[PDB]
């Protein structure tokens, strides 16, 4: 049941579906070592079948409006993932998560995809409050937030376990009302 | 059966199927009151629907993904203290609570909260306790300050309630045993 959110001449967001699993799994394996530097989970990655269960879970949430999982394709090549880890329908708030294949960084691809996604959901009107939580020492992530006009709202002490230590987490938000 | 002691007159009991009739009654009795601060009370309907929700929370509770405890005062069900959600890897949980309106003003929530947090910190599986609460919910913000939570931030228009969006304070306390 295909769903695309245009981003640019070379970029688009496609709702995750079963056919994306093999390529997404490979993409995770390919970037596993570098992602483990910023994220805890790449570690537990094992088989394509387990990755499938996870996507399958997100697809149900995506369909019920309780989360979203989009894959970023650059020139028809899978380049990364942009998601709402959770949506709070009544508060019209959503928490954002993302990562890019390492050789796709530095081209404003995440910023553009993010800008397109947020715009899409604010115009639909079902999400107006967008949140990014990211480790205080995640430089690239904090830069995405700033560049995309999120307001720092606070800092959560030792909120995130990563590589043997609990790290502080900046909390950013941006409110968009398509009046 | 799980009980966390609090005082000679107070204890916390993990919610179970047997509590459903009385919990459903307490919720009906306090609906109007709770709607002043909470959005969920007005979707309340039948005892069956309540049993549905408790069965699901009991599974989360057993799996360690949330906890639902009932506060008993001299053997009378007086409110709920729960971890709305736990992030096992981060050893962090989000706190939710409410008291029947007539049990306010006796430190019942503070005492229960204190025992609960100390219990989990001794277990070692939760070290970070979080309280999200509306900037204008005086009673809740008092619970967080009274119990030594530190204000970490203020979330703009994070909660929709009674026709308005409200800024929400985020408090946290880290306890290592
Ligand atoms: C976080 C992450 C997605 C950011 O990647 P990114 O490529 O830096 O992000 P953007 O797409 O916004 O690109 C910004 C960069 O591209 C440049 N750029 C080029 N064209 C651009 C455009 N059209 N618009 C905006 N920036 C543009 C900017 O100058 C900037 O360059 P610089 O960082 O070299 O100064 C990436 O580092 C990654 O996947 N990290 C690992 C996983 C992780 O940390 N995820 C987040 C956990 S909270
Ligand atoms: C939030 C709520 C649980 C707070 O109730 P509470 O009774 O005020 O909480 P506490 O247990 O901390 O009791 C503190 C009060 O009892 C008093 N008290 C008496 N003995 C006490 C004791 N031994 N220890 C601590 N406080 C004591 C305090 O002085 C204080 O009185 P005050 O309100 O006049 O200042 C209650 O108002 C409620 O259920 N609200 C509606 C639902 C809601 O807001 N939930 C939270 C959503 S974030």
What topology emerges from the helices and strands here?
2 copies of one chain form a homodimer.
Chain A: E1 4-6, E2 11-15, H1 21-35, H2 48-64, E3 68-74, E4 77-88, E5 93-100, H3 109-124, E6 129-135, H4 139-147, E7 151-162, E8 165-175
Parallel strand pairs in A: 5-6
Antiparallel strand pairs in A: 1-2, 2-3, 3-4, 4-5, 6-8, 7-8
The complex binds coenzyme A (COA) (2 copies).
Question: Could you describe the 3D structure shown?
Answer:
Two copies of one chain form a homodimer. With 179 residues, chain A is of the alpha+beta class. Chain A has helices at residues 21-35, 48-64, 109-124, 139-147; strands spanning 4-6, 11-15, 68-74, 77-88, 93-100, 129-135, 151-162, 165-175. The longest helix of chain A is centred in the first third of the chain and has 17 residues, at 48-64. The radius of gyration of chain A is 16 Å and the shape is globular. The A-B interface holds A 40, 90-93, 129, 151, 153-161, 166, 171, 173, 175 and B 39, 89-92, 127-128, 130, 150, 152-160, 165, 170, 172, 174. One coenzyme A is lined by residues 35, 38-39, 98-100, 105-112, 134, 138, 140-141, 143-144, 147 of chain A. Chain A: CoA binds at residues 38, 98, 100, 106, 108-111, 134, 138, 147. Chain A: One of its GO terms (molecular function) is protein N-terminal-serine acetyltransferase activity. Chain A: This is Acetyl transferase. Chain A: It comes from Salmonella typhimurium (strain LT2 / SGSC1412 / ATCC 700720).
């Amino acid at each position: 049941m295909v769903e695309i959110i245009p981003v640019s001449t070379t970029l688009e967001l496609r709702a995750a579906d079963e056919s994306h699993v093999p390529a997404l799994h490979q993409l995770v394996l390919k970037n596993k070592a570098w992602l483990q530097q910023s994220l805890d989970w790449p570690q537990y990655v094992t088989s394509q079948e387990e990755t499938r269960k996870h996507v399958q879970g997100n697809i149900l949430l995506h369909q019920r409006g309780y989360a979203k999982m989009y894959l970023i394709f650059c020139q028809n090549e899978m380049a990364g993932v942009l998601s709402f880890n959770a949506i709070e329908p009544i508060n019209k708030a959503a928490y954002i998560g993302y990562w890019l294949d390492e050789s796709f960084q530095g081209q404003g691809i995440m910023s553009q995809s993010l800008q397109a996604l947020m715009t899409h959901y604010a115009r639909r009107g079902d999400i107006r409050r967008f949140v990014i939580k990211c480790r205080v020492d995640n430089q690239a992530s904090n830069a995405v937030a700033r560049r995309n006009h999120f307001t720092l709202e606070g800092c959560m002490k030792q909120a995130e376990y990563l590589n043997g230590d609990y790290h502080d987490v900046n909390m950013y938000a941006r409110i968009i009302d398509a009046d």
